[PDB]
Design a protein around this ligand. Structure first.
Ligand SMILES: [Mg+2]
Ligand SMILES: [Mg+2]
Ligand SMILES: [Mg+2]
Ligand SMILES: [Mg+2]
Ligand SMILES: [Mg+2]
Ligand SMILES: [Mg+2]
Ligand SMILES: [Mg+2]
Ligand SMILES: [Mg+2]
Ligand SMILES: [Mg+2]
Ligand SMILES: [Mg+2]
Ligand SMILES: [Mg+2]
Ligand SMILES: [Mg+2]
Ligand SMILES: [Mg+2]
Ligand SMILES: [Mg+2]
Ligand SMILES: [Mg+2]
Ligand SMILES: [Mg+2]
Ligand SMILES: [Mg+2]
Ligand SMILES: [Mg+2]
Ligand SMILES: [Mg+2]
Ligand SMILES: [Mg+2]
Ligand SMILES: [Mg+2]
Ligand SMILES: [Mg+2]
Ligand SMILES: [Mg+2]
Ligand SMILES: [Mg+2]
Ligand SMILES: [Mg+2]
Ligand SMILES: [Mg+2]
Ligand SMILES: [Mg+2]
Ligand SMILES: [Mg+2]
Ligand SMILES: [Mg+2]
Ligand SMILES: [Mg+2]
Ligand SMILES: [Mg+2]
Ligand SMILES: [Mg+2]
Ligand SMILES: [Mg+2]
Lengths: 233, 252, 121, 52
RNA sequence: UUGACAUUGUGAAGAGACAUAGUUUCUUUACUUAUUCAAUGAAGCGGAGCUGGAAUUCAUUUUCCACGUUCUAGCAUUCAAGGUCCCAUUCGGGGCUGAUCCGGGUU
RNA sequence: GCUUGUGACGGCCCGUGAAAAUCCACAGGAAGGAAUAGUUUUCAUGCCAGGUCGUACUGAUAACCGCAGCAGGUCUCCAAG
RNA sequence: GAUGGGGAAGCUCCGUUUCAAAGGCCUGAUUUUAUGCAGGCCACCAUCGAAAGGGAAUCCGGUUAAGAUUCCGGAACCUGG
């Protein structure tokens, strides 16, 4: 009120300088930004062949969380942990005269691509996890097919980084179980089943299903409006 | 023999343009938000000579919609526009001399200038003193608009291609005999190094297809094929008829 | 949550931490000594007759002086090497490629004394 | 002009050493009237909106 | 310059063979991501919605246009005044709204 | 009067006869400011400093180019009766 | 004529703001302290290229065998602090 005054302001073309708005939709990104964006786009416009696109079908957040939960109980030794174990066996074994078996049979997650592969091949794994990233996708594309043939129940999972966490590397590519303490075989059968029902069983049908072929949405609206109107008046 | 003249022009050395004095490049406003949703006002602050150009330019200044400042444009002055006049640019603008409108928004028979070939190219068609184009058609679906260019040719372009109402100023310039050699001289002095012109037929063979002989003569058909090759094409290139044009011209 | 909000459409190179050099061995082990001290600045008296006249009549010392040296360095070096105050300093380059300094002393000093106290005449 | 007192670089009217006075008589009247007729323009069409 | 092959992909109608099931090949005409051209200190795109209103209602909306500037050679800038909420009231200062939503395809 | 400078004009052009550094001004009003005393250096006066390189002479029937102290060539200012 | 670049077997050729994440000023925040962060800007994108173009400011008198708008005398003016 006082000697204060309502002025409004008219931004209606022809007058008043435009205000500051969010041009974020318009900013001229650095090329590296523009490329990786359009890579994802271009990747989706093309019709991607079935043996890719069987990926993208990531495990669901609930089951996975339940699966990381288990796998976490099986992390590989830590630097300390192993150092500690050594001095335990290195001292004790050599004197107590045990057969290099004053160490308990370790149960941990198997990893590394080449490791896990011969494992699957030798029917020793019981649950392979495969990341959905993995940029030369080839390191990994033969795995569902493989795991299928070896009757080894597997799951494609969000997170090469996250497979990396549970194994102490930045990344991982694959994480696998072969062994397990009896206190856990229970929830692993359970786990294996959800997974088996989402992947291994569905593998044959997924194999027939090409992917991609998706329009951008300026084009989508174009034919959602052209195809609404044309046929049904 | 030697490289003939019309192939030397290409490396542009002495043949580049005499640009030092020109006002700048004539162009329409950039096809921004204003000009393509509504209109936008300006003032012709000055209309002025451009060296080596027939037609005068019109300096026209506009507010920046996005910043507090003046932004000046260089227009080719249509006949009749005057300093201090308001110029209107936009789809929703009104049809008077000076204003700039998209060929879609102006009826058949509108007479416009400096028109774009594709929307936004900031002005391509009819800019020489006197010239203009006339809208002769519209095709509401796929918005084309048909025009006749100064050459007589008819083209079709986007309805959004902008033009400016009226005709370019300074017309008639070429009705005036140049009278003497120097008046050409000074003309070309402010254009390019294209003048005067030795006839090839006055040259020697090293110089030209036409050179040599004990009398001056062209020695073979002076109509040369399109498939000719550089160093060959002097004469009447790809000429499809030849000789005194008797009878009314003018496209059907 | 959601995205940033850039009001401008130009993206610019981020302002990134510029660390200053903290070496691990040194440039040259021993710094260079003063490449142009008063003894290397001011080379000899110039004692042509027509220069002595500037001393006698002009309260002016003429020295041949280092090429690498300017009016500043000449002035200071004369001050320091000779216990004198300097009014102004004029220089030129001789035609054998040597710098000559017309050094004017202030009214308190007497270049002539000062001339045959450094020992020429 | 940087070696000279500021009174050598203006007259004391508005737009002093910049615009020619007769020219500021001008922009004053224009400013006034146009701002007036602006109030005139809005009440003509404020009515039109309620009279149609 | 003209043809073939490679860059080369996606629909649709039509021709063409195992001899009238659809793997395959060309004629047409669609698609956009390759490729190509233009523009801009990648500024207002595409989709929905508000209000108005032409419209004629065959149950009620089935739609279509709009949806801040044109007597005048002025003036238009300080995240905007206003409105409203916070800091613990200092001067300063911050959100929201003013300026509708949704998609990040610069057009 | 002569030479040069300059003004206000007038002729001409399909010719209408550079740029940038730099300087000032104005529109704006962020903000900063007095009565026990504040603002003010575009008013005056006052203090210190201003580096580096060139700087002689010839410039022509002998100091430059023409094999040379060559009747040739080689840009320009001042201009008495 | 460098530069992100694009050609070229390559000596190098093209491009000069060009399909580039191109850079720097004003003061504030420090009263561990010297200068990090806090705003707001401005997006101009090298550089060389005129001793006749543009351009801050000096004059008269005297003086040398040979320098002088440069020394001496007197009287100024400009830029920066
Ligand atoms: Mg453990
Ligand atoms: Mg050119
Ligand atoms: Mg010529
Ligand atoms: Mg001819
Ligand atoms: Mg001729
Ligand atoms: Mg001849
Ligand atoms: Mg020939
Ligand atoms: Mg021939
Ligand atoms: Mg002949
Ligand atoms: Mg003849
Ligand atoms: Mg004495
Ligand atoms: Mg000197
Ligand atoms: Mg005055
Ligand atoms: Mg004021
Ligand atoms: Mg754009
Ligand atoms: Mg003269
Ligand atoms: Mg004139
Ligand atoms: Mg001024
Ligand atoms: Mg403030
Ligand atoms: Mg002063
Ligand atoms: Mg310095
Ligand atoms: Mg001399
Ligand atoms: Mg002589
Ligand atoms: Mg001679
Ligand atoms: Mg180059
Ligand atoms: Mg230079
Ligand atoms: Mg100069
Ligand atoms: Mg000069
Ligand atoms: Mg004298
Ligand atoms: Mg002497
Ligand atoms: Mg002399
Ligand atoms: Mg003096
Ligand atoms: Mg001063």
């Amino acid at each position: 009120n006082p000697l204060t005054h309502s002025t409004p302001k008219n931004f209606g073309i022809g007058q008043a300088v435009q205000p500051k708005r969010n041009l974020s939709r318009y900013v001229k990104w650095p090329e590296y930004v523009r490329v990786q964006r359009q890579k994802k786009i271009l990747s989706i416009r093309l019709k991607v062949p079935p043996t890719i696109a069987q990926f993208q079908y990531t495990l669901d957040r609930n089951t996975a969380a339940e699966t990381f939960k288990l796998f976490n109980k099986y992390r590989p030794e830590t630097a300390a942990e192993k150092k500690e174990r050594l001095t335990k066996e290195a001292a004790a074994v050599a004197e107590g005269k045990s057969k290099q078996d004053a160490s308990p049979k370790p149960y941990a997650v198997k990893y590394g691509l080449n490791h896990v592969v011969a494992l699957i091949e030798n029917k020793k794994a019981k649950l392979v996890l495969i990341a959905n990233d993995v940029d030369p996708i080839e390191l990994v594309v033969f795995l569902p097919a493989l795991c299928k043939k070896m009757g080894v129940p597997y799951a494609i999972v969000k997170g090469k980084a996250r497979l990396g966490t549970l194994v102490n590397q930045k990344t991982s590519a694959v994480a696998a179980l072969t062994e397990v303490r009896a206190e856990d075989e229970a929830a692993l059968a359970k786990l294996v089943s959800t997974i088996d029902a989402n992947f291994a069983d569905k593998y044959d049908e997924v194999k027939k299903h090409w992917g991609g072929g998706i329009l951008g949405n300026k084009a989508q609206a174009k034919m959602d409006k052209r195809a609404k109107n044309s046929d049904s008046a | 023999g030697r490289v003939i003249r019309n192939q030397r022009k290409g490396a542009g050395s002495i043949f580049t343009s005499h640009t030092r004095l020109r006002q700048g490049a004539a162009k329409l406003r950039t096809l921004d938000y204003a000009e393509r949703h509504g209109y936008i006002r300006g003032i012709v602050k000055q209309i002025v000579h451009d060296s080596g150009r027939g037609a005068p330019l019109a300096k026209v200044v506009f507010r920046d919609p996005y910043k507090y400042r003046l932004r000046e444009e260089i227009f080719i002055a249509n006949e009749g526009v005057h300093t201090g006049q308001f110029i209107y640019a936009g789809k929703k603008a009104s049809l008077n001399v000076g204003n700039v409108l998209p060929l879609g928004s102006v009826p058949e028979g509108t007479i416009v200038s400096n028109v774009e070939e594709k929307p936004g190219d900031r002005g391509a068609l009819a800019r020489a003193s006197g010239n203009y184009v006339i809208i002769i058609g519209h095709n509401p679906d796929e918005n084309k608009t048909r025009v006749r260019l100064p050459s007589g040719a008819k083209k079709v372009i986007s309805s959004d291609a902008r033009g400016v109402i009226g005709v370019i100023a300074g017309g008639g310039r070429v009705d005036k005999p140049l009278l003497k050699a120097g008046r050409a001289f000074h003309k070309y002095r402010l254009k390019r190094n294209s003048w005067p012109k030795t006839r090839g037929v006055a040259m020697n063979p090293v110089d030209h297809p036409h050179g040599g002989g004990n009398h001056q003569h062209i020695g073979k058909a002076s109509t040369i094929s399109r498939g000719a090759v550089s160093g060959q094409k002097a004469g009447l290139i790809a000429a499809r008829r030849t000789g005194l044009l008797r009878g009314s011209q003018k496209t059907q | 949550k959601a995205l940033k909000v850039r009001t401008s459409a130009t993206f610019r190179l981020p302002k990134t931490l510029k660390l200053a050099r903290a070496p691990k061995y040194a440039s040259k082990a021993v710094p260079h000594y003063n490449r142009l001290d008063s003894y290397k600045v001011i080379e000899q008296p110039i004692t042509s007759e027509t220069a002595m006249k500037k001393v006698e009549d002009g309260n002016i010392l003429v020295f041949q002086v280092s090429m690498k040296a300017n009016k500043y360095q000449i002035k200071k070096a004369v001050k320091e090497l000779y216990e004198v105050d300097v009014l102004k300093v004029n220089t030129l380059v001789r035609p054998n490629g040597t710098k000559k300094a017309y050094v004017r002393l202030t009214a308190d000093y007497d270049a002539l004394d000062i001339a045959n106290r450094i020992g020429y005449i | 002009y940087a070696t000279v007192s500021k009174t050598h670089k203006t007259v004391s009217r508005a737009y002093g050493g910049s615009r020619c006075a007769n020219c500021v008589k001008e922009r004053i009247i224009r400013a006034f009237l146009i701002e007036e007729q602006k109030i005139v323009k809005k009440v003509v069409k404020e009515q039109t909106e309620a009279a149609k």
